[PDB]
Design a protein around this ligand. Structure first.
Ligand SMILES: NC(=O)C1=CN([C@@H]2O[C@H](COP(=O)(O)OP(=O)(O)OC[C@H]3O[C@@H](n4cnc5c(N)ncnc54)[C@H](OP(=O)(O)O)[C@@H]3O)[C@@H](O)[C@H]2O)C=CC1
Ligand SMILES: NC(=O)C1=CN([C@@H]2O[C@H](COP(=O)(O)OP(=O)(O)OC[C@H]3O[C@@H](n4cnc5c(N)ncnc54)[C@H](OP(=O)(O)O)[C@@H]3O)[C@@H](O)[C@H]2O)C=CC1
Ligand SMILES: [Cl-]
Ligand SMILES: [Cl-]
Ligand SMILES: [Cl-]
Lengths: 257, 263, 261, 262
């Protein structure tokens, strides 16, 4: 249904979860794909499985911490050298934080904002010149419903996310004259390492309880792949008239009309 | 997953514009599609063209007034009889209305309100028994950015469309336990009979369709610098109607080419 | 304060409507109000004249769903109190129903009541408002407009339409100096809540205690029901020159119910 | 507005909206403390205020709100001098003009730090006081940029959004201890910036009043003029006072009709 064989897609934080699910979806659409992450071994393992599942795959995997501008510049340039100028950028890297206002220190605030903001600023700034040389150029920033609907034990992440949402609109407006669309998704509760971590403190039942307590209308946790599909629609020419917007991937958690 | 071969999709107002492009994308995904519309001739013509393009397609088209409760109940009956119980429903908004507040009589207010609300309430109420008996059931209501960002010459339509946007959120929550997801799209300026007619009545005679629409898009400050295409709107609807949006309910997709100023 | 103002309050014989009239008279404004029940209209009228001696007060039976009545009410206000500078639209109730429970008739009824209770008085009173200084319209509304609730489907929808209409009127009327804003009430103390308290099973909590636990149970952060006077104070702010750079907006009077940032 | 029983703290109170807020609180009979970075600016302001309000209970101290210890000492000084604080108002430092392309990492960090800590520090320092008082309320001054960004205010818009989100979380968290929290969203308000821009205009023929009217039309402000600090101050006062006793986790629009959102 979606044919991205012409595309060169970059995914930051692509070695697991939503990022990996996104990379998988991209290879399947025949796109040349590049992904980065900090952990080299998980990165190469993921890389091997990908090449397995997708024999022809044009795939480039590189260690890179998006918090380091210098690393991001080098990653962008190595991407261009290996696959050509990027046409798609998915900023996924990120790690939520559990804290009330009372529990969040200045140090934790700074860390939270720096992570949520620069994991988007760095890759966008380093790859924009490649994006703006390509047709069907699109950026997708992964975000959470917290950005528009805060939760009590996610005070700092919710506020940082809000900033990043606002930034997506600004980037959409700024880049539109150069042909680059910019959107994001707002995930709800999605199965993750963290949620299996908590479980260890059947699984498909302890989660059902969680979704029931969390009042998720669809009555289950989200799947990484589902987040990936919204990303894919937004990254692809299927949404060519959509920019400066978000797709809700929360299972009906947004109380707002 | 854009393999909708086992889906039964219903599109109200599907003989033209966004409705028609949605039907095409549905047939193309292999779904069995039913659609209705008022103009019989328009409906028939679009029907035969669809069958040429999609040989072997399971397609049921019937003249229907969605504002008429009884007609809609009958059209739902024929749909289940003809294709089987619906799994997807797409309510394709009637039309807009150009009017400031000062220019909107009581009669125009009523007419606008009833159109936007009942064009959704009737099909939904009628097909709900069907949608709720299926798996992967979804409803998409076609709406406009006017719903959350009003425009001066579209006062009544914006207000009516806000109501429907709100109702979409309610239906999603209410139908959730039964497996039926409910979303909308929010179109911007999208090529249509209205813009086509507006281009016929234009003052700038020197300009052709291509030039006039670009001038219009610039004048409207559309960041993407052009009017939307019905197929683009149809594509967002297809995503929301399909299992690809399986964890998305009570929401909307923006199809306005960057017109929404809200963050 | 508002002694130079002519304030009209549609639906002003009880609840938030009456509370707004009370505040307006207190601010020293000439005040007009309408409602359907003449008996209650006049009882309210009679109490207010006592409470506010020498008050410039005009009260009249009017169904806001009837254009010609609203028109007659507007003409009468001008003859009696002079040209209107402030308009508060309050008329209308809430309807309890799921989507399933809501008939076509009920939908039509709700849409009619919510919309025309605003459209009619605004249209009838605009010419007065647009010849006055410091002219303002306030449309009473509910958080339901942006955050619908399950057993209030039809009302939530019509309220959202009216909310969107407030934005359009603000933008439309601003060249002629008329500001337009609304409020979004949460759970407010009504005779209907008094009803339930009276028949509590079979607690020893007084009104304030029972209402407090009810609020916790409805997860209102502020931990109690809203009082008509609190809605009225926001209306007063929005009606008055104190909010002269505020148009096309809403003030949240829900006690913290809005989940949206 | 009888706030004679109130003790109100205004960070950023030496000029603009902050000073208009300080004046309104004082007219309302409240004990008032404010802080600022420029000593000379703060002193001049403090002095003028005393001449205006003879006998006022007024404390003013230089303080960098980005410095947690200065803020802490300031909060100590406020309590010892005026008594426990019951009202806190956090005035937005200022806006930064640049596009995304124009914003360096450094600019991004200071912009985020400024907007976030200018709220985080005073809240955390004063909260123990606020929760000791009835009718306690916090107001955070913000901009419409938080929900409706503008192209030459990219970093500030995003930082404003973060802070608007935070206001919702703080109202929910502090609600149990009786402290309400809200903000305001200013549009274009007369200020040093605009006076500066007026001073460097092409059309010298236009004076201040004519120029801002034209500017207002150009910016498509429905009310057709720039706001005045006193207008922002009046909305902050409403939100700070018992008049808004059932309002928390919210914002009041003070943009003159610039919000396109219904
Ligand atoms: O759920 P996680 O926190 O594990 O994040 C999901 C993905 O994002 C990556 N990621 C997290 N932080 C960074 C970072 N700072 N720079 C680049 N990639 C990152 C992770 O790889 P990794 O944890 O190896 O960085 C992982 O692939
Ligand atoms: O909660 P309620 O409707 O009981 O209160 C709202 C107020 O508005 C008035 N009101 C309700 N409907 C109308 C109407 N259609 N026209 C004029 N006033 C109205 C009511 O007075 P009343 O019930 O007398 O109309 C009431 O005093
Ligand atoms: Cl998160
Ligand atoms: Cl209601
Ligand atoms: Cl600003």
């Amino acid at each position: 249904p979606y044919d991205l064989s012409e595309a060169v897609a970059v995914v930051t934080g692509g070695s697991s979860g939503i990022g990996l699910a996104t990379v998988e979806l991209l290879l399947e659409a025949g796109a040349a794909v590049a992904f980065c992450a900090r952990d080299g071994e998980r990165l190469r393992a993921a890389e091997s499985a990908l090449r397995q599942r997708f024999p022809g795959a044009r795939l480039f995997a590189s260690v890179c911490d998006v918090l380091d501008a210098l690393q991001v510049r080098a990653f962008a340039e190595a991407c261009e050298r290996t696959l050509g100028c990027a046409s798609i950028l998915v900023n996924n890297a990120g790690q939520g934080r559990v804290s009330t206002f009372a529990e969040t220190t200045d140090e934790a605030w700074s860390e939270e904002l720096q992570l949520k903001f620069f994991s988007v600023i760095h890759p966008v700034r380093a790859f924009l010149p490649q994006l703006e040389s390509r047709a069907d150029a699109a950026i997708v920033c992964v975000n959470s419903l917290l950005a528009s609907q805060p939760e009590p034990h996610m005070v700092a992440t919710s506020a940082a996310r809000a900033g990043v949402k606002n930034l997506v609109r600004s980037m959409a407006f700024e880049f539109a004259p150069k042909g680059v669309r910019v959107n994001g998704i707002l995930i709800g509760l999605v199965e993750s390492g963290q949620w299996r971590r908590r479980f260890e403190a059947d699984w498909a039942q302890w989660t059902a309880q969680l979704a029931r307590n969390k009042q998720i209308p669809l009555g289950r946790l989200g799947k990484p792949i589902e987040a990936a599909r919204a990303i894919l629609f937004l990254a692809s020419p299927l949404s060519a008239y959509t920019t400066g917007s978000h797709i809700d991937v929360s299972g009906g958690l947004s109380r707002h009309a």
